[model samples]
Target: QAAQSVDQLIKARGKVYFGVATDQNRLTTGKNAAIIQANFGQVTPENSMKWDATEPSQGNFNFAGADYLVNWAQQNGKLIRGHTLVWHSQLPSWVSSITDKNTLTNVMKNHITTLMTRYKGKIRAWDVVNEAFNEDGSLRQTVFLNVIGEDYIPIAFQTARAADPNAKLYINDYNLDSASYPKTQAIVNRVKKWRAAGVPIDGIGSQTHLSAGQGAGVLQALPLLASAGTPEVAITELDVAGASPTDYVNVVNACLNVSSCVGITVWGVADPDSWRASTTPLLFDGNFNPKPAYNAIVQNLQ
Candidate 1:
């Protein structure tokens, strides 16, 4: 029965991975590691690889946490999706306080260079930029945007391209699960603009953090993202905020329907490890047992 895995099923039927976001703590504890190893094909470090955890200081860096997860993933035969190279949240104060364009640009490039170079061919992909746009589709005014202007997006992706040419680079964001969402079109437009200008952007990551019964919208929305002509699309951070079996199936079916929807990454290994633990969003229950949603996912994949 262990051979009939969710990820393996997806690979056989849909040619895509089923991944989960995790950290060192969860990976070392309880039945989490066993479930993750058995069910998922890929791993994304939830926080260890983020700005704050990787580089707490401006020039000084620490990769201890991220490295552990990366090495574990490698040993466990799981593909790695680097959580992010650039993001507004969890940024150091020194980074946020920077007022000069060139200064911030150099800092960002240095960070990407350090991380990507360290884990070059090991990582399958990286979220080059995360949540760069607002819900209204306008670019958010972060330190990168405030000083470096709109070109920051391209600058970040290009820098990442040089650091690890083999890895798929993506811009990741939440609330882009629907075609009608302004933020979705904004991401598509940016990708089109950058590609036309010779900037290297490989994929779009829709962080499908949806509520119960909302997964149907994703089925239609995924195709719209492919309209940008991007080669790959993924449900990067998926978690339905209630134990809805149909929700998980619909999300998996959405990716299955779209050839370019290459993967679906549930945000955590189990409900207790999820950020929205109270809502029980993940496929596994608090006791680390596969829930109906998990079965639904595997069934649909078959």
Candidate 2:
């Protein structure tokens, strides 16, 4: 036998998931799509599952792209992450225009309910809310906050729970690898608060977008987070295409070191397709060649 792949090693260790994020087009048709299919076992789309992608216009929804992602994940026997229910960016104008708190709440609940209903059993997890708080431990001034207050987050989770009880739910955010940052404590405090309040948040996500040889402390901090009120944890969206090769090794090992980590999802693949294209963040290069980062992940797949 050759060797068990990274995905297999993950399952061999336990029930942890190894994932990557990409869009349907790139996943199905891009030059490096094969690389994506062969290595990781779970999938999340960078934009396909967002609010605007699902409902470009209010009440008139489109799930074709998002569904394609789900279908592909299913066909491949891969887990699909319902990336986001509420976020400050990539939302349709109609959502931001809803000044009435009641109407906005209804729209949010209805959206979650409908999507969860459509893919009730398929989703492996969901980033129920994204970037909900600023670095200073204050809520972001997104329209949801301006109108409905912090209650919107709990509502989002509750609504998601009501719709799809099976899928793991998470509050995903960036800059979590650095425990020293106030942002990290903000997240910890928020999770503690929600857990105390008896909310339905199942997990917390750390979007570890690293710079070259920077902020490896997040690795240590993340495990600590898992010990807190967070029932489950994930290194959800790692992107360090520009970082040193050692950085990649450190980041993956960080996930492996954490007992509470259920998964890790790299943000994208291939230098050309990455959102941070300038930095060249990802496991593969544009020509389908595995970069040092890929080897780092493979070698470090404990």
Candidate 3:
């Protein structure tokens, strides 16, 4: 019945799908796989295949956990979304140690090729790049930029496409949905430039880690992201933190109103296990129960 709870939601809303954020531990074990098979059609592994986890040392790869998850998705007939291929965080020390742009670019290309080639047709969508821009839309100063330069962005997409021509590549970020910020606009312009140059970009992932009452502004930025021409828009990492029901409803309504926004995935399903409990926001209490914001999400999705 616990598994059927989310399954019921998916059946009720024929057009929408439910997904879970999983890690290596959950996927390698049968318990989590059974739960997901019972309820959802989409799955995003939380961190099994990040750059650091996949290629901890140069040319030395680790696929133990990632293979488990991807194979699980395949056996169950589920859609696989790669959590990330590139990000400033969770990076291996070897990556940051590179000081030359040419050498760094070569390393980046090899990493993408090795992993994407392995997964190829098995994975459907990918968060090709993550959190590349700050809230103000300026480039986030990290090893990728400082060592490989901004060209690393397009280079990654190009490499991924060469490895797997079938996968849909995307740019993912947090706080880009906030309507009040200029960063969203900056992304829109950058994506446009990429498209003009014939980059193989398929979608934009707006990480909906919002406070209360910011949905309207967030929704307003969706169209701008699509202006340059893309097929899909997704609320990739959605979690309405804090105890405010009003804010939760706003975020829900904002997502529901956007036609291009194809999928919505909460960061976690219950309060007790939610990442926000330890943070400044309280989206859930200590128990694995639905908070007010959780109920608000249910009602909106319904």
Candidate 4:
């Protein structure tokens, strides 16, 4: 039979790394660290390390929650995937209010330098840039673009590399599955250009949040990303919501087929506790019981 939970299945498979999306409330105590040690060999403290949390003022910085998580991960021999170093969302008031290109660029550089320098070797990978494009492969018109222009993504990656020369740097986003093949292709093309120009990119993070069958087409894009010769590819944020058992099984089987896809992470462990409870996508109910999708995933991974 399949293991009792996804964590068990992963452990049985000898997969050492797993991802968890975290919030401020969870990282405040020893309980979060204990829970992480039990289930995962690595963790991604989802939104707690974003711009708003790390840099609330122009020159002032905060790393309270992020430091807790990194310290815990280090104590347990676990790795960390930095959720993001740059994004258009969760900006501080000072950043959002900026309307000048040069000022924004300097602020961006300082932010990356401060955080990366603080956690230099502890962070295993960084989503150096996140969600900068829309479904049509055009810029998403975020405040970053409105202020500092299109060079924001590259600048962030370059700054991260300069600060922590050893960490793997990634660009992360959602909706890059098969259904959004054009956007995925466009991203691959853009990354290729960045690489050719000597950008310090190391990996691609496919945030695979889907409703079971919705992910079948992602196989087509895996080869495209691999063709770029990146050292690693990951299903960075994985979950299934609004789908039956068979669909989740399909999703797992599909991921296993791609040799380049090295890791799969369920966004949260229980449905009621899932961020998707606010929406409709999740893999478990409130009681932590296995949903059909959960069982399907376990069986497929085994």
Best by lDDT: 1
Q: Which stretches of candidate 4 lie over 4 Å from their true place?
A: 1-16, 27-35, 278-280
Candidate 3 ranges beyond 4 A from true positions: 1-16, 27-35, 243-245, 279-295
When summed lDDT is taken over every stretch of 10 residues in candidate 4, the lowest stretch is 27-36
Taking the tens digit of each residue's C-alpha lDDT, what string does model 3 give over 166-225?
Answer: 888999988777555788888888888887887888888887777655666665766666
Evaluated against the true structure, the overall lDDT of model 1 is 0.88
Give the 10-residue window scoring lowest on summed lDDT in candidate 2. Answer: 1-10
Q: TM-scores of the models, in the given order?
A: 0.98, 0.95, 0.87, 0.88
lDDT of 3: 0.72
lDDT of 4: 0.72
Model 4: per-residue lDDT, tens digit, 1-302? 11354655665665545556765565553344445556556778777689988888888787888887788778877678887877878887898888889998999999888888999987878888889779887878887788887678778888999999888898888878774467787888888888888888888888877764666666665556656667777778877667566545555554566565656666765555566765445564554445677666666757
Best by TM-score: 1
Q: Which pairs clash (backbone N, Cα, C closer than 3 Å) in model 3? A: none
Give me the runs in candidate 2 sitting further than 4 Å from their true place. Answer: 1-4
lDDT of 1 by residue, 1-302 (tens): 24458889888985668889988998888887888788898999999999999899987899999999999999999999998888889898989999998999999999999999999999989999999989998998888999898889889989999999999999889988888989888888878988999888899899999997888888888888877777889999999989699888888888888888888899998888889999999888877788888887777778
* Ranking of candidates on TM-score, top first: 1, 2, 4, 3
